[PDB]
Amino acid sequence: QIVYKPVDLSK
Amino acid sequence: QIVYKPVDLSK
Amino acid sequence: QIVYKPVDLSK
Amino acid sequence: QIVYKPVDLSK
Amino acid sequence: QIVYKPVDLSK
Amino acid sequence: QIVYKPVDLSK
Amino acid sequence: QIVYKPVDLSK
Amino acid sequence: QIVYKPVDLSK
Amino acid sequence: QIVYKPVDLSK
């Protein structure tokens, strides 16, 4: 189960 | 189960 | 189970 | 010649 | 000639 | 000629 | 404003 | 403002 | 403002 958010600036 | 967030500035 | 956040300045 | 497999869980 | 496998749990 | 595997736990 | 060039061999 | 060039061999 | 170039051999 995979999470890949290399440039995360999310609120 | 994987987390990869190398540039995380998220709120 | 993996964590990789090398530039984390998240709030 | 390019290899880019950032989240590799292959058998 | 390039190899980039930052998360690698492959068999 | 390049190798980059910062989280390698491959078998 | 975002730059993401993970394998850059550009001239 | 974000810069991410992990394998940069550019000229 | 972020800079991330872990394998920079650029000219």
The pair of three-digit structure tokens given for residue E11, joined into one six-digit string: 């068999």
Resolution expressed in Å = 2.7
- Comparing CA positions, the residue from F4, G10, F3, C7 lying closest to residue I10 is G10
- Comparing CA positions, the residue from H7, E6, A7 lying closest to residue B2 is E6
Which helix (DSSP H) or strand (DSSP E) does residue A2 occupy?
A: strand A2-4
Does B4 touch chain D if contact means CB atoms closer than 8 Å?
Answer: yes
Structure determination technique employed: cryo-EM
CA C7 to centroid of chain Cα atoms: 6
For residue E2, what are the contacts with CB-CB under 8 A and spacing of at least 6? D1, D2, D3, D4, F1, F2, G7, G9, H7
Q: Which of B2, B8, B11 sits opposite C8 (nearest CB)?
A: B8
Contact residues, chain B, for D9 at CB < 8 Å: 2
Residues E1, E5, E10, CA angle at the centre, nearest 5°?
A: 125
* Number of CB atoms found within 10 A of residue E11's CB: 7
Amino acid occupying residue D9: L
Does A3 touch chain G if contact means CB atoms closer than 8 Å?
Answer: no
- Comparing CA positions, the residue from D9, A7, D2 lying closest to residue E3 is D2
The pair of three-digit structure tokens given for residue A10, joined into one six-digit string: 């999310």
| Helix runs in chain A, H state only | none
Amino acid occupying residue B6: P
Both ends of chain I: CA-CA distance in Å? Answer: 23
DSSP secondary-structure letter at A6? S
Q: Using CA atoms, how far apart are residues F4 and H5, in angstroms rounded to an integer?
A: 13
